[PDB]
């Protein structure tokens, strides 16, 4: 719910945007 942080980690050589809602992570 408080979401941000979770998905910006990704971004080592592949993945970025979204959140998703609470849930969170790569994938594209």
């Known amino acids: 719910v408080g979401c ?3 998905p910006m ?3 080592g050589k592949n993945a ?3 959140c998703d809602d ?3 992570n ?3």
């Open 16 to 18: 970025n945007p979204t």
């Open 4 to 6: 941000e942080e979770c």
């Open 22 to 24: 609470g849930v969170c």
């Open 9 to 11: 980690h990704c971004k």
């Open 26 to 28: 790569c994938n594209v």
